[PDB]
Every structure is written in C-alpha cells, then in structure tokens.
Amino acid sequence: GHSVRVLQELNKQREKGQYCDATLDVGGLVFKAHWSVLACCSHFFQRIYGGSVVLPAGFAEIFGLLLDFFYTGHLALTSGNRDQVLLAAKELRVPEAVELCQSFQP
Amino acid sequence: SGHSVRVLQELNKQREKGQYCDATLDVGGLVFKAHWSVLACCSHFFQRIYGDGTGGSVVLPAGFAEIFGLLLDFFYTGHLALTSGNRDQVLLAAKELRVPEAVELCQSF
C-alpha cells in the first residue's frame, strides 16, 4: 500500500497548500493542487502548464468533486450533478471522469 | 492495483522524463528530477531542504550516487531493489536521508 499512502499524503498536502505549485480559482473558490497530479488525469492541465489559473465559474459547484477524484479516485456522482460533472470533465479533458459520468447508473 | 497505483506510476513516468518536476537532485554529478511533494512524503530531510532554503538544484555529496536511483525508485514504486550487495549502502543512505520505510526493509532482509 505504498502508493495509497503517498497519494493520501499528497491529498493531505494540498488541503494545506503544502508543496502546491498550482493554485486554481473557480468562481470565487481558490484551490491548491500539484501540477504533477493534475497532469496525471487531465489533458487540459497538461497543456496549460508552462502562475495562478482561473477556471469557469460555472464549475464552482462541482469543482471540489472533480479534484477529490484526482487525489482519491472517487467521483462523488449523483443524478443531480451528473450532467454538470460530465460537462466539466469533457472540457478539462479528464478521460476517466467522462467515462464514469457516461456509465453512471443511479 | 487501483487509482493510487496508476497515479503514482504516472508521476514515476513523469520524473523519468523530467516532466512537471520541481526538484533537481544533484548527487555528486548525476542529477535526478523529482517532485518535492513526493519527496516530502518519504523523507523529512527533503522537507527541510525545501523549506530551509536551497535555491533550485539540491547538491548532495557523491557518496550516494551509486544507490540513490534505487532509493528514489522506492519513493515512486514502493519497491527497493535490495540486493545482497547493496543492502548496506542502501540502509546507510536511508538512515542518512531519513527514510524510515526504507530502513525497515533493509533490515527485514
């Protein structure tokens, strides 16, 4: 379980903003994260990497879910947020997330 | 396996190409690219270097060069190629670099 422990330590790290070279502003919510983790699950983040990134405010409601998924592998889906998460996952080029939303069975 | 396995393998792949790596480890001449975030999870020695100032490149003494890659492979994979011929130069480096999990194995065998 070495990799499980490392990722939850990374997750704990970003909650505290530690070692986080990436700060994301969506709506009015600011999020700390690691570019390296973001690049693992998102083609959009891979592409805009080259300080401070602003994302569409219409994602604020579900951005935390999307990010938790990156650090934990669990996308907090619901019949009520499914279409929102899907739209955000497509735009942010998060392959695994689109698959999860499309296959989602309430 | 699982989600964490896949993410760490990607970060491993990343550093093996110097992508999204914010750390440069210069050990006696051979450099290793890595992620501070991951370095911090396994050793407080790296936590201190990161905070207690060190500009950019981290310069360690050439003594580890030999085994360093192994110790670093362990960070990104959870497995240290503990050979009967390195078991000692690996353990000494683990205690030196302050990597608790690494020493434990060196001892186990």
XYZ file of N, CA and C in Angstrom:
645
model
N 0.816 -1.251 0.000
C 0.000 0.000 0.000
C 0.831 1.273 0.000
N 2.062 1.179 -0.490
C 2.927 2.345 -0.540
C 2.293 3.492 -1.325
N 1.809 3.198 -2.528
C 1.211 4.233 -3.364
C -0.081 4.811 -2.784
N -0.834 4.004 -2.041
C -2.060 4.501 -1.426
C -1.675 5.563 -0.398
N -0.714 5.232 0.466
C -0.251 6.166 1.490
C 0.302 7.463 0.891
N 1.096 7.357 -0.171
C 1.676 8.542 -0.807
C 0.607 9.481 -1.358
N -0.369 8.925 -2.062
C -1.410 9.760 -2.620
C -2.264 10.414 -1.537
N -2.542 9.725 -0.431
C -3.335 10.384 0.604
C -2.498 11.406 1.359
N -1.181 11.275 1.286
C -0.315 12.253 1.927
C -0.286 13.463 0.980
N -0.389 13.209 -0.319
C -0.403 14.305 -1.280
C -1.737 15.024 -1.125
N -2.803 14.249 -0.943
C -4.126 14.818 -0.769
C -4.136 15.685 0.482
N -3.553 15.170 1.566
C -3.463 15.923 2.816
C -2.630 17.186 2.579
N -1.575 17.051 1.780
C -0.715 18.173 1.452
C -1.470 19.325 0.786
N -2.231 19.022 -0.259
C -2.951 20.076 -0.964
C -4.070 20.740 -0.152
N -4.657 20.014 0.791
C -5.701 20.597 1.627
C -5.061 21.740 2.422
N -3.766 21.599 2.704
C -2.999 22.587 3.462
C -2.141 23.471 2.555
N -2.239 23.271 1.247
C -1.461 24.067 0.314
C 0.034 23.794 0.313
N 0.456 22.707 0.945
C 1.877 22.378 1.013
C 2.423 21.820 -0.295
N 3.585 22.323 -0.697
C 4.256 21.866 -1.908
C 3.401 22.002 -3.158
N 2.381 22.854 -3.104
C 1.474 23.037 -4.237
C 1.825 24.158 -5.210
N 2.453 23.792 -6.323
C 2.827 24.763 -7.344
C 1.633 25.280 -8.150
N 0.437 24.771 -7.875
C -0.737 25.210 -8.616
C -1.856 25.710 -7.731
N -2.385 26.872 -8.073
C -3.491 27.441 -7.339
C -4.568 27.696 -8.388
N -5.747 27.133 -8.156
C -6.863 27.250 -9.073
C -7.975 28.111 -8.500
N -8.446 29.061 -9.302
C -9.522 29.975 -8.916
C -10.748 29.661 -9.781
N -11.813 29.161 -9.167
C -13.028 28.870 -9.916
C -14.129 29.605 -9.168
N -14.947 30.362 -9.892
C -15.975 31.132 -9.224
C -15.163 32.018 -8.307
N -15.410 31.926 -7.010
C -14.638 32.724 -6.078
C -13.783 31.804 -5.230
N -13.995 30.506 -5.403
C -13.269 29.495 -4.655
C -11.843 29.283 -5.166
N -10.876 29.324 -4.253
C -9.478 29.095 -4.602
C -9.090 27.690 -4.128
N -8.398 26.943 -4.984
C -7.983 25.567 -4.698
C -6.492 25.379 -4.891
N -5.857 24.674 -3.961
C -4.430 24.402 -4.066
C -4.289 22.994 -4.610
N -3.272 22.768 -5.434
C -3.051 21.452 -6.010
C -1.640 21.331 -6.554
N -1.290 20.125 -6.998
C 0.020 19.849 -7.578
C -0.124 19.719 -9.094
N 0.694 20.443 -9.851
C 0.615 20.327 -11.300
C 0.836 18.881 -11.734
N 1.767 18.191 -11.084
C 2.058 16.802 -11.424
C 0.846 15.877 -11.303
N 0.020 16.073 -10.273
C -1.170 15.237 -10.078
C -2.218 15.626 -11.110
N -2.356 16.927 -11.340
C -3.313 17.433 -12.314
C -2.983 16.923 -13.713
N -1.696 16.790 -14.021
C -1.293 16.305 -15.337
C -1.586 14.816 -15.513
N -1.667 14.083 -14.405
C -1.939 12.646 -14.454
C -3.342 12.306 -14.928
N -4.289 13.197 -14.667
C -5.668 12.921 -15.024
C -6.296 13.889 -16.009
N -5.605 14.981 -16.316
C -6.166 15.984 -17.209
C -5.292 16.445 -18.371
N -5.821 16.343 -19.583
C -5.077 16.783 -20.756
C -5.086 18.300 -20.809
N -6.125 18.908 -20.239
C -6.242 20.365 -20.207
C -5.141 20.955 -19.339
N -4.882 20.337 -18.190
C -3.837 20.841 -17.311
C -2.452 20.536 -17.865
N -2.343 19.470 -18.637
C -1.064 19.151 -19.234
C -0.704 20.279 -20.201
N -1.690 20.701 -20.983
C -1.498 21.735 -21.987
C -1.228 23.157 -21.515
N -1.885 23.597 -20.450
C -1.676 24.961 -19.988
C -0.570 25.101 -18.961
N 0.308 24.111 -18.900
C 1.427 24.139 -17.961
C 2.681 24.665 -18.668
N 3.260 25.736 -18.137
C 4.455 26.311 -18.743
C 5.215 27.276 -17.840
N 1.581 31.197 -13.607
C 1.138 31.051 -12.229
C -0.269 31.578 -11.985
N -1.070 30.809 -11.248
C -2.454 31.166 -10.924
C -3.339 30.921 -12.137
N -4.252 29.966 -12.012
C -5.144 29.613 -13.100
C -6.599 29.839 -12.715
N -7.346 30.514 -13.585
C -8.760 30.758 -13.334
C -9.583 29.854 -14.248
N -10.538 29.140 -13.667
C -11.408 28.242 -14.423
C -12.815 28.828 -14.458
N -13.665 28.356 -15.377
C -15.030 28.888 -15.457
C -15.834 28.775 -14.169
N -16.440 29.890 -13.777
C -17.239 29.975 -12.562
C -18.414 28.993 -12.535
N -18.845 28.541 -13.708
C -19.948 27.597 -13.759
C -19.553 26.210 -13.271
N -18.282 26.053 -12.890
C -17.766 24.778 -12.401
C -17.632 24.769 -10.878
N -17.719 25.949 -10.272
C -17.578 26.087 -8.828
C -18.335 25.045 -8.009
N -19.616 24.878 -8.302
C -20.445 23.925 -7.578
C -19.866 22.508 -7.512
N -19.253 22.031 -8.594
C -18.709 20.678 -8.586
C -17.192 20.523 -8.748
N -16.450 21.621 -8.718
C -15.006 21.513 -8.884
C -14.299 20.704 -7.795
N -14.763 20.821 -6.556
C -14.154 20.061 -5.483
C -14.281 18.560 -5.723
N -15.413 18.135 -6.282
C -15.640 16.717 -6.554
C -14.593 16.233 -7.525
N -14.498 16.969 -8.619
C -13.579 16.672 -9.692
C -12.154 16.568 -9.143
N -11.775 17.498 -8.275
C -10.438 17.476 -7.717
C -10.255 16.322 -6.726
N -11.256 16.068 -5.885
C -11.146 14.964 -4.938
C -10.853 13.703 -5.734
N -11.591 13.523 -6.824
C -11.415 12.370 -7.697
C -9.953 12.190 -8.105
N -9.273 13.294 -8.391
C -7.877 13.235 -8.801
C -7.035 12.604 -7.700
N -7.208 13.099 -6.479
C -6.451 12.616 -5.333
C -6.979 11.377 -4.603
N -8.189 10.918 -4.919
C -8.716 9.753 -4.224
C -9.296 8.687 -5.138
N -9.583 9.035 -6.382
C -10.140 8.045 -7.287
C -11.650 7.915 -7.179
N -12.275 8.732 -6.337
C -13.722 8.677 -6.186
C -14.412 9.963 -6.631
N -15.258 9.846 -7.655
C -16.026 10.969 -8.209
C -17.408 10.957 -7.526
N -17.689 11.943 -6.670
C -18.971 11.995 -5.950
C -20.199 12.239 -6.817
N -20.508 11.292 -7.692
C -21.655 11.415 -8.577
C -23.030 11.289 -7.907
N -24.019 11.914 -8.540
C -25.417 11.891 -8.118
C -26.206 12.185 -9.381
N -27.466 11.772 -9.423
C -28.287 12.015 -10.603
C -28.419 13.515 -10.819
N -28.356 14.262 -9.727
C -28.475 15.705 -9.814
C -27.245 16.460 -10.292
N -26.047 15.909 -10.100
C -24.858 16.624 -10.546
C -24.167 15.985 -11.740
N -24.655 14.818 -12.146
C -24.063 14.073 -13.249
C -23.773 14.840 -14.532
N -24.750 15.582 -15.043
C -24.527 16.337 -16.277
C -23.513 17.464 -16.101
N -23.476 18.055 -14.910
C -22.542 19.136 -14.622
C -21.123 18.592 -14.609
N -20.921 17.509 -13.861
C -19.607 16.897 -13.746
C -19.114 16.445 -15.105
N -20.013 15.866 -15.894
C -19.665 15.390 -17.231
C -19.177 16.544 -18.112
N -19.926 17.641 -18.123
C -19.543 18.777 -18.943
C -18.170 19.299 -18.517
N -17.933 19.364 -17.211
C -16.653 19.858 -16.708
C -15.512 18.896 -17.022
N -15.797 17.599 -16.947
C -14.803 16.570 -17.220
C -14.379 16.608 -18.691
N -15.339 16.809 -19.593
C -15.021 16.882 -21.021
C -14.148 18.099 -21.311
N -14.574 19.252 -20.816
C -13.842 20.492 -21.021
C -12.419 20.431 -20.462
N -12.255 19.819 -19.296
C -10.938 19.721 -18.685
C -10.166 18.500 -19.179
N -10.720 17.831 -20.185
C -10.083 16.662 -20.780
C -9.690 15.638 -19.716
N -10.654 15.222 -18.902
C -10.414 14.229 -17.853
C -11.132 12.944 -18.276
N -10.492 12.148 -19.157
C -10.962 10.875 -19.727
C -11.686 9.952 -18.763
N -11.016 9.596 -17.673
C -11.610 8.703 -16.693
C -12.908 9.253 -16.117
N -12.969 10.565 -15.914
C -14.167 11.191 -15.365
C -15.332 11.162 -16.350
N -15.060 11.349 -17.638
C -16.152 11.305 -18.597
C -16.702 9.885 -18.615
N -15.818 8.893 -18.650
C -16.262 7.502 -18.664
C -17.181 7.215 -17.462
N -16.767 7.676 -16.284
C -17.551 7.469 -15.083
C -18.937 8.109 -15.182
N -19.005 9.338 -15.686
C -20.284 10.033 -15.816
C -21.187 9.362 -16.840
N -20.606 8.975 -17.972
C -21.363 8.332 -19.038
C -21.881 6.957 -18.649
N -21.115 6.229 -17.849
C -21.513 4.899 -17.422
C -22.364 4.936 -16.160
N -22.358 6.078 -15.479
C -23.108 6.222 -14.245
C -24.537 5.713 -14.336
N -24.904 4.907 -13.345
C -26.226 4.304 -13.238
C -26.751 4.623 -11.836
N -27.670 5.596 -11.723
C -28.223 5.969 -10.413
C -29.006 4.850 -9.718
N -4.502 -3.625 -8.146
C -3.930 -2.252 -8.210
C -4.910 -1.188 -7.684
N -5.226 -0.197 -8.513
C -6.134 0.851 -8.084
C -5.739 2.235 -8.565
N -6.591 3.213 -8.290
C -6.339 4.584 -8.702
C -5.000 5.150 -8.234
N -4.633 4.872 -6.988
C -3.382 5.378 -6.434
C -2.170 4.758 -7.115
N -2.307 3.496 -7.501
C -1.241 2.791 -8.182
C -1.001 3.467 -9.526
N -2.076 3.701 -10.275
C -1.947 4.329 -11.584
C -1.394 5.750 -11.512
N -1.832 6.535 -10.533
C -1.341 7.904 -10.421
C 0.153 7.959 -10.091
N 0.592 7.111 -9.171
C 1.995 7.106 -8.786
C 2.890 6.590 -9.912
N 2.356 5.711 -10.758
C 3.134 5.183 -11.866
C 3.289 6.260 -12.928
N 2.310 7.154 -13.003
C 2.345 8.237 -13.975
C 3.331 9.300 -13.502
N 3.344 9.557 -12.198
C 4.269 10.526 -11.627
C 5.666 9.930 -11.788
N 5.777 8.613 -11.651
C 7.069 7.963 -11.805
C 7.523 8.180 -13.239
N 6.628 7.897 -14.179
C 6.902 8.078 -15.593
C 7.324 9.533 -15.811
N 6.550 10.456 -15.255
C 6.855 11.872 -15.367
C 8.306 12.221 -15.006
N 8.706 11.918 -13.770
C 10.053 12.232 -13.303
C 11.152 11.524 -14.091
N 10.806 10.420 -14.747
C 11.786 9.693 -15.552
C 11.960 10.422 -16.884
N 11.318 11.580 -17.001
C 11.386 12.394 -18.210
C 11.520 13.861 -17.814
N 11.545 14.109 -16.508
C 11.669 15.467 -16.013
C 10.437 16.331 -16.204
N 9.274 15.713 -16.355
C 8.043 16.471 -16.559
C 7.358 16.861 -15.252
N 6.901 18.108 -15.194
C 6.217 18.662 -14.023
C 7.021 18.469 -12.740
N 8.331 18.285 -12.877
C 9.203 18.090 -11.727
C 9.738 19.413 -11.214
N 9.556 19.677 -9.924
C 10.034 20.921 -9.335
C 11.323 20.738 -8.536
N 11.860 19.524 -8.529
C 13.091 19.262 -7.797
C 14.188 18.667 -8.677
N 15.410 19.142 -8.470
C 16.570 18.659 -9.196
C 17.533 18.174 -8.133
N 17.801 16.880 -8.140
C 18.691 16.299 -7.160
C 20.023 15.985 -7.825
N 21.036 16.733 -7.414
C 22.381 16.619 -7.948
C 23.216 15.855 -6.931
N 23.441 14.573 -7.179
C 24.213 13.780 -6.240
C 25.583 13.380 -6.786
N 26.567 14.238 -6.515
C 27.929 14.002 -6.954
C 28.159 14.147 -8.447
N 27.149 14.610 -9.169
C 27.318 14.758 -10.598
C 26.133 14.262 -11.396
N 25.539 13.141 -10.994
C 24.376 12.677 -11.741
C 23.142 13.288 -11.088
N 22.308 13.920 -11.904
C 21.117 14.554 -11.377
C 19.882 13.702 -11.613
N 18.917 13.875 -10.719
C 17.651 13.170 -10.755
C 16.566 14.223 -10.650
N 15.568 14.143 -11.513
C 14.455 15.075 -11.445
C 13.384 14.392 -10.591
N 12.697 15.158 -9.757
C 11.663 14.576 -8.916
C 10.634 15.620 -8.532
N 9.658 15.203 -7.733
C 8.602 16.081 -7.256
C 8.818 16.271 -5.762
N 8.885 17.523 -5.322
C 9.080 17.802 -3.913
C 7.949 17.172 -3.122
N 6.733 17.310 -3.634
C 5.548 16.767 -2.986
C 5.727 15.296 -2.633
N 6.295 14.527 -3.560
C 6.525 13.105 -3.331
C 7.762 12.909 -2.451
N 8.776 13.748 -2.636
C 9.983 13.642 -1.832
C 9.642 13.885 -0.369
N 8.721 14.812 -0.122
C 8.318 15.164 1.232
C 7.580 14.045 1.961
N 6.857 13.216 1.215
C 6.117 12.094 1.796
C 7.009 11.011 2.387
N 8.198 10.843 1.823
C 9.091 9.781 2.264
C 10.278 10.141 3.153
N 10.643 11.417 3.200
C 11.791 11.846 3.995
C 11.629 13.264 4.514
N 11.912 13.490 5.792
C 11.783 14.848 6.304
C 13.046 15.604 5.945
N 14.074 14.874 5.516
C 15.310 15.522 5.099
C 14.974 16.425 3.913
N 14.158 15.918 2.997
C 13.759 16.706 1.844
C 12.772 17.800 2.235
N 11.986 17.566 3.283
C 11.032 18.577 3.733
C 11.799 19.809 4.191
N 12.917 19.576 4.871
C 13.738 20.661 5.380
C 14.465 21.421 4.285
N 15.060 20.696 3.342
C 15.769 21.337 2.241
C 14.806 22.272 1.518
N 13.599 21.783 1.276
C 12.580 22.556 0.589
C 12.214 23.849 1.315
N 12.180 23.798 2.641
C 11.825 24.976 3.404
C 13.013 25.801 3.856
N 14.000 25.139 4.453
C 15.196 25.816 4.949
C 16.105 26.316 3.828
N 15.476 26.823 2.768
C 16.187 27.374 1.625
C 17.265 26.538 0.963
N 17.243 26.539 -0.368
C 18.211 25.817 -1.197
C 18.048 26.217 -2.661
N 17.736 27.491 -2.888
C 17.555 27.982 -4.242
C 16.818 27.018 -5.162
N 17.562 26.400 -6.077
C 16.962 25.465 -7.009
C 17.516 24.061 -6.887
N 18.622 23.806 -7.573
C 19.257 22.494 -7.551
C 19.719 22.097 -6.148
N 19.451 20.855 -5.767
C 19.854 20.347 -4.460
C 21.151 19.582 -4.671
N 22.222 20.006 -4.006
C 23.516 19.352 -4.172
C 23.925 18.451 -3.012
N 23.857 17.141 -3.235
C 24.226 16.153 -2.225
C 25.635 15.631 -2.496
N 26.276 15.030 -1.485
C 27.627 14.503 -1.706
C 27.592 13.254 -2.591
N 28.605 13.112 -3.441
C 28.718 11.999 -4.382
C 28.636 10.607 -3.770
N 28.717 10.521 -2.452
C 28.658 9.223 -1.808
C 27.478 8.322 -2.148
N 26.296 8.895 -2.357
C 25.117 8.082 -2.649
C 24.935 7.703 -4.119
N 25.378 8.575 -5.023
C 25.257 8.362 -6.466
C 24.897 6.924 -6.813
N 25.761 6.008 -6.400
C 25.588 4.580 -6.624
C 24.161 4.084 -6.415
N 23.740 4.089 -5.154
C 22.433 3.600 -4.730
C 21.229 4.543 -4.818
N 21.471 5.847 -4.947
C 20.396 6.845 -4.987
C 19.200 6.501 -5.868
N 19.465 6.094 -7.107
C 18.393 5.743 -8.020
C 17.444 4.737 -7.406
N 17.999 3.756 -6.697
C 17.203 2.724 -6.043
C 16.308 3.339 -4.996
N 16.926 4.101 -4.104
C 16.215 4.759 -3.025
C 15.082 5.607 -3.602
N 15.343 6.223 -4.748
C 14.366 7.067 -5.410
C 13.310 6.231 -6.143
N 13.676 5.020 -6.550
C 12.723 4.151 -7.227
C 11.691 3.720 -6.199
N 12.165 3.516 -4.980
C 11.315 3.110 -3.882
C 10.258 4.178 -3.603
N 10.650 5.446 -3.693
C 9.722 6.554 -3.457
C 8.525 6.474 -4.401
N 8.807 6.283 -5.680
C 7.754 6.223 -6.674
C 7.129 4.857 -6.959
N 7.646 3.790 -6.359
C 7.088 2.458 -6.620
C 6.776 1.635 -5.376
N 7.472 1.913 -4.281
C 7.252 1.153 -3.068
C 8.164 -0.064 -3.012
N 9.030 -0.214 -4.009
C 9.945 -1.347 -4.042
C 11.406 -0.949 -4.229
N 12.247 -1.311 -3.267
C 13.668 -1.016 -3.384
C 14.416 -2.291 -3.751
N 15.102 -2.260 -4.890
C 15.864 -3.404 -5.383
C 16.976 -3.780 -4.406
N 16.574 -4.164 -3.203
C 17.502 -4.533 -2.149
C 18.300 -5.786 -2.503
N 19.522 -5.580 -2.994
C 20.426 -6.671 -3.370
C 21.354 -6.993 -2.206
N 21.843 -8.228 -2.171
C 22.754 -8.663 -1.118
C 24.022 -7.803 -1.142
N 24.319 -7.232 -2.307
C 25.495 -6.390 -2.458
C 25.274 -4.908 -2.193
N 24.024 -4.506 -1.981
C 23.737 -3.102 -1.708
C 23.040 -2.916 -0.368
N 22.422 -3.983 0.121
C 21.702 -3.945 1.387
C 22.318 -3.017 2.437
N 23.638 -2.854 2.402
C 24.327 -1.996 3.366
C 24.424 -0.545 2.910
N 24.871 -0.336 1.674
C 24.987 1.012 1.133
C 23.606 1.614 0.880
N 22.566 0.803 1.052
C 21.196 1.265 0.861
C 20.643 1.696 2.209
N 20.926 0.888 3.224
C 20.461 1.161 4.573
C 21.147 2.412 5.109
N 22.447 2.521 4.867
C 23.198 3.673 5.344
C 22.667 4.962 4.724
N 22.227 4.869 3.472
C 21.701 6.027 2.763
C 20.295 6.356 3.254
N 19.539 5.320 3.603
C 18.179 5.500 4.090
C 18.185 6.229 5.428
N 19.071 5.820 6.329
C 19.160 6.466 7.633
C 19.684 7.888 7.464
N 20.602 8.049 6.523
C 21.216 9.334 6.231
C 20.194 10.317 5.651
N 19.419 9.843 4.677
C 18.395 10.651 4.023
C 17.099 10.692 4.821
N 17.076 9.963 5.931
C 15.918 9.916 6.817
C 14.684 9.313 6.170
N 14.820 8.089 5.679
C 13.710 7.396 5.046
C 13.369 6.175 5.891
N 12.472 6.346 6.874
C 12.033 5.279 7.779
C 11.615 3.975 7.101
N 10.653 4.038 6.185
C 10.192 2.837 5.485
C 11.326 2.079 4.789
N 12.284 2.816 4.236
C 13.406 2.202 3.535
C 14.289 1.363 4.457
N 14.646 1.908 5.616
C 15.487 1.181 6.560
C 14.810 -0.113 7.019
N 13.516 -0.031 7.333
C 12.731 -1.182 7.785
C 12.966 -2.410 6.910
N 12.915 -2.210 5.598
C 13.123 -3.302 4.660
C 14.577 -3.758 4.671
N 15.505 -2.809 4.586
C 16.926 -3.146 4.602
C 17.199 -4.119 5.739
N 16.458 -3.952 6.828
C 16.602 -4.803 7.999
C 15.917 -6.145 7.763
N 14.653 -6.098 7.354
C 13.890 -7.310 7.084
C 14.706 -8.306 6.258
N 15.573 -7.783 5.390
C 16.449 -8.594 4.541
C 17.003 -7.759 3.387
